[PDB]
Amino acid sequence: GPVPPSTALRELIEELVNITQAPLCNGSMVWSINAGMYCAALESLINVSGCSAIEKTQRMLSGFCPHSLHVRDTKIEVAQFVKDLLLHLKKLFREGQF
Amino acid sequence: DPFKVLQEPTCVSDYMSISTCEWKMNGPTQCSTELRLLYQLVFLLSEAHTCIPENNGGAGCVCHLLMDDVVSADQYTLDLWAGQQLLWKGSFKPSEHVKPRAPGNLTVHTQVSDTLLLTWSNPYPPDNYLYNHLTYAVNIWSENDPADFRIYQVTYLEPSLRIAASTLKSGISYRARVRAWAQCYNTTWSEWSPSTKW
Amino acid sequence: QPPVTNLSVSVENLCTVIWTWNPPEGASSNCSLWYFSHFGQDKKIAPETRRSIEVPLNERICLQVGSQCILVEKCISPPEGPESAVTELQCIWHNLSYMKCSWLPGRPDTNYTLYYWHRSLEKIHQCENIFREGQYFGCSFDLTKHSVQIMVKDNAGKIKPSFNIVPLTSRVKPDPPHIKNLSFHNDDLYVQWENPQNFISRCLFYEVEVNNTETHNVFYVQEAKCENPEFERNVENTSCFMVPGVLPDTLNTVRIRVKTNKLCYEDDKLWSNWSQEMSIGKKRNS
Ligand SMILES: *[C@H]1O[C@H](CO)[C@@H](O[C@@H]2O[C@H](CO)[C@@H](O)[C@H](O)[C@H]2NC(C)=O)[C@H](O)[C@H]1NC(C)=O
Ligand SMILES: *[C@H]1O[C@H](CO)[C@@H](O)[C@H](O)[C@H]1NC(C)=O
């Protein structure tokens, strides 16, 4: 759109930092991506059940992906999923990418 | 009655709770009776909502689409209901048309060194994204001579401004209002706060 | 689904605790071999017959392991002496050049050694640049642009070793910035400074102070995007702030400060040192 690109990801970051601060989401396990997409991170989250604490983030992630994963290997906790994603987006933010 | 939309519905978002959509029909109307505004978050797992529009000029109307919160990606299906008949199907991205809430609780206080201190309140809670990204504009002008004006630019975090009274007439009375915008979203300015005089 | 055979705990590097085991031996079935492991909390399901965790050893730690598609528990303990251990062990990555760690004693006359390791080091290294500031013992090693492991013990056993994992996205204290010039334009003061070497404005958060007898003013700026190419020079390694409502008739004195925000790294509230001061305006020679 007509808004600066940095601001999108900027918001995503601040939310995760904010969310990582009830810890988190009854611990429901999700498949990791241990790059690739924002979609991979999306389709592993929208599997969570009644954890509305992570709702906004899901919507945020769905904006990085245009309109059932690909290599189901491990399955960590949500908090550990988020904590791990957070510092990766930080890297891209320092790198000034997308 | 050829019911028609003479002006395509425009919309802006406070990026908090309320959005504002305005449109103009091709003739006088009672929207509280005739028009309905159905909007749905295209985060599909999500329910459509009805909006009861209010008259906005006897031939124009406005509705307020209530919301829990909003994020950049968020997008909405908009449909304008009469009756059953058409028309408007529309998409809306609150992120694209941010219209920040107006700042408030503006006062003036007398400090040492014959300096003046103006203060106001950030219209958002610390949790809200805009909270840290609001740069203000203070507008001080004389009523006597509206030509004798002054405009300041506030880019810091503390919603405050201190100036030297030596910049006033020492004589006349002044009115002053502030407004805000987020440079991070390239938004239109807010509404001017309730002007003060001292 | 029987339990896993012979769970083993091994410490790699400084504090990389590594649990290992063999499959359930035996069934065969068709339900594929799959493993789940707790903490004391920290849950994980995987096929691998091992789990590697990075954690301090200032306490005991137990992994329990099941099998599905009954839990076995093996644990590691630290070596102790416990009240004989360093208090308030802390590190800071200075300007992304060198790491500076300090500690206090535990509540004889004893010598401390600090060791450190991280991702790209063929050996655990021992720090040699020790220092003393009042009641404090400390070290400084070079570290130039993941996590770093730090432990400190005694030269002659005796004391319970003390561990510390430094994330490397926190504990970053940038060097102080440098004011490049002060200017006026119809009573708007413009301040233009230079951020420290290895930082881009985008990652920083600013504090400007201004002094006007006395009036200690201080601002907090989220972003200092710089766009007046008339009342500045432009080094584009440069950031700029405008202090409105100041008159040229008085002498204002300016300093700048900086710290990494919540993006890029953490907001550990680690302000750099103050910049050297720079003044503008009409003086008064009392
Ligand atoms: C800030 O963002 C605004 C809005 O995106 C930019 O204004 C747009 O300018 C382009 C041409 O540069 C026009 O085609 C668009 O119509 C404008 N956007 C809309 C939809 O209103 C503006 O250029 C940016 N301002 C700065 C200083 O970059
Ligand atoms: C002052 O006005 C603001 C903005 O309308 C409002 O949020 C706030 O509740 C008011 N603060 C006080 C103490 O009333």
CATH assignment at residue B130 = 2.60.40.10
Dist CA B117 CA B103 (whole Å): 17
Atom of ligand 1 nearest to the CA of A1: 5
DSSP H or E run through A61 = helix A55-61
How many Cβ atoms are within 10 Å of C46's Cβ, its own excluded? 16
User: Domain boundary at B35, B63, B98, which?
Assistant: B98
> Which amino acid, residue A57?
T
User: Domain boundary at B63, B98, B133, which?
Assistant: B98
Four-point Cα dihedral B151, B157, B158, B164, nearest 10: -30
Q: Is residue A81 helix, strand or coil?
A: helix
Closest to C69 measured CA to CA, from C39, C26, C29, C18: C29
Distance, C-alpha B181 to centroid of its chain? 9
Q: What are the backbone dihedrals phi and psi of residue C49, each rounded to the nearest 5 degrees, phi first?
A: -85, 25
d(CA B87, nearest CA chain C) in Å? 44
End-to-end CA distance of chain B: 54
Identify any residues that bridge with B24 across adjacent strands, giving them in sequence order: B7, B60
B121 and B81 within one domain: no
Instruction: Please name the chains neighbouring C, where neighbouring means 3+ C-beta pairs under 8 angstroms.
Output: A, B
8 A C-beta contact, residue C164 and residue C171: no
Helix A6-19 × helix A78-95 angle, to 10°: 150
Dist CA C207 CA C193 (whole Å): 12
Dist CA C119 CA B133 (whole Å): 37
Q: Which residues contact B108 (CB under 8 A, 6 or more apart)?
A: B116, B117, B118, B176, B196, B198
8 A C-beta contact, residue B141 and residue B168: no
Domain count, chain B: 2
B123 and B32 within one domain: no
- Nearest CB neighbour to C44, from listed A10, A74, A93: A74
Q: Is residue A95 helix, strand or coil?
A: helix
The domain ranges of chain C are 1-80, 81-175, 176-286
B195 and B122 within one domain: yes
B64 and B132 within one domain: no
Kindly determine whether residue C264 and residue A90, on different chains, have CB atoms separated by under 8 Å.
yes
Q: What is the CATH number of domain A1-98?
A: 1.20.1250.10
8 A C-beta contact, residue C110 and residue C88: no
Dist CA C186 CA C183 (whole Å): 10
Dist CA A63 CA A44 (whole Å): 15
Q: What is the experimental method? A: X-ray
Q: Is residue B22 helix, strand or coil?
A: strand
Identify any residues that bridge with B5 across adjacent strands, giving them in sequence order: B25
Q: With helix as H, strand as E and coil as C, how does chain C read?
A: CCCCEEEEEEEECCCEEEEEEECCCCCCCCCCCCEEECCCCCCEEECCCEEEEECCCCCCEEEEEEECCCCEEEEECCCCCCCCCCEEEEEEEECCCEEEEEEECCCCCCCEEEEEEECCCCCCEECCCEEEECCEEEEEEECCCCCEEEEEEECCCCCCCEEEEECCCCCEECCCCEEEEEEEECCEEEEEEECCCCCCHHHEEEEEEEECCCCEEEEEECCCCCCCCCCCCCCCCEEEEEEECCCCCCCEEEEEEEEECCCCCCCCCCCCCCCCCEEECCCCCC
Own/partner pairs for A94-98, CB < 8 Å, 24+ apart?
Answer: A94/C200, A94/C202, A94/C203, A94/C264, A96/A6, A96/C200, A96/C202, A98/A5, A98/A9
User: How is chain A split among helix, strand and coil, in percent rounded to 5?
Assistant: 50, 5, 45
Strands in B89-92's sheet, in edge-to-edge order, are B48-51, B35-41, B76-82, B89-92
What is the resolution of the experimental data for this entry, in Å? 3.0
Site to substitute for ligand 2 among B105, B119, B191, most atoms within 8 A of C-beta: B105
Identify any residues that bridge with B12 across adjacent strands, giving them in sequence order: B20
Instruction: Please name the chains neighbouring A, where neighbouring means 3+ C-beta pairs under 8 angstroms.
Output: B, C
Q: Residue B141 is part of which domain span? A: 99-198
Mutate to test the interface with C, among B138, B153, B155, B161 (most CBs of C within 10 A): B155
- Whole-angstrom CA distances from B68 to B16, B18, C228 are 8, 9, 39
Strands in C216-221's sheet, in edge-to-edge order, are C216-221, C204-211, C252-260, C278-280
Instruction: Let me know if C2 is exposed, middle or buried by CB neighbors in 10 A (0-12, 13-18, 19+).
Output: exposed
For residue B75, how far is its CA from the centre of ligand 1 (angstroms)? 20
Q: What are the backbone dihedrals phi and psi of residue C123, each rounded to the nearest 5 degrees, phi first?
A: -140, 150
8 A C-beta contact, residue B18 and residue B49: no
Rg, Å, chain C Cα set: 27
Of the listed ligands, the closest to the CA of A4 is 1
B73 and B32 within one domain: yes
Kindly determine whether residue C247 and residue B167, on different chains, have CB atoms separated by under 8 Å.
yes
Dist CA C192 CA C184 (whole Å): 12
d(CA C21, nearest CA chain B) in Å? 43
Dist CA C100 CA C139 (whole Å): 6
Answer whether CATH 2.60.40.10 is correct for domain C81-175.
yes
Dist CA B13 CA B101 (whole Å): 9
Copy the structure tokens of residue A6.
């940095």
B63 and B1 within one domain: yes
8 A C-beta contact, residue A60 and residue A42: no
Domain C1-80 in this protein, CATH class: mainly beta
Topology classification of domain C176-286: Immunoglobulin-like (2.60.40)
Copy the structure tokens of residue B64.
């307020």
Copy the structure tokens of residue C107.
């509540």
Report which DSSP code applies to B188: P
Closest to B167 measured CA to CA, from B116, B131, B105: B116
Task: Locate the DSSP E strands across A8-95.
Answer: 30-31, 75-76
Dist CA C21 CA C6 (whole Å): 6
Kindly determine whether residue B161 and residue C212, on different chains, have CB atoms separated by under 8 Å.
no
Residue of A nearest to C48 (CA): A74
Chain C contact for A93 (CB, 8 A cutoff): yes
Instruction: Let me know if B96 is exposed, middle or buried by CB neighbors in 10 A (0-12, 13-18, 19+).
Output: middle
8 A C-beta contact, residue B4 and residue B26: yes
Copy the structure tokens of residue A34.
């241990």
> Which amino acid, residue A88?
H
Dist CA A48 CA A78 (whole Å): 9
User: Domain boundary at B71, B98, B125, which?
Assistant: B98
Chain C contact for A8 (CB, 8 A cutoff): no
Closest to C253 measured CA to CA, from C225, C217, C220, C226: C217
8 A C-beta contact, residue B51 and residue B65: yes
d(CA B158, nearest CA chain C) in Å? 7
Chain A contact for B71 (CB, 8 A cutoff): yes
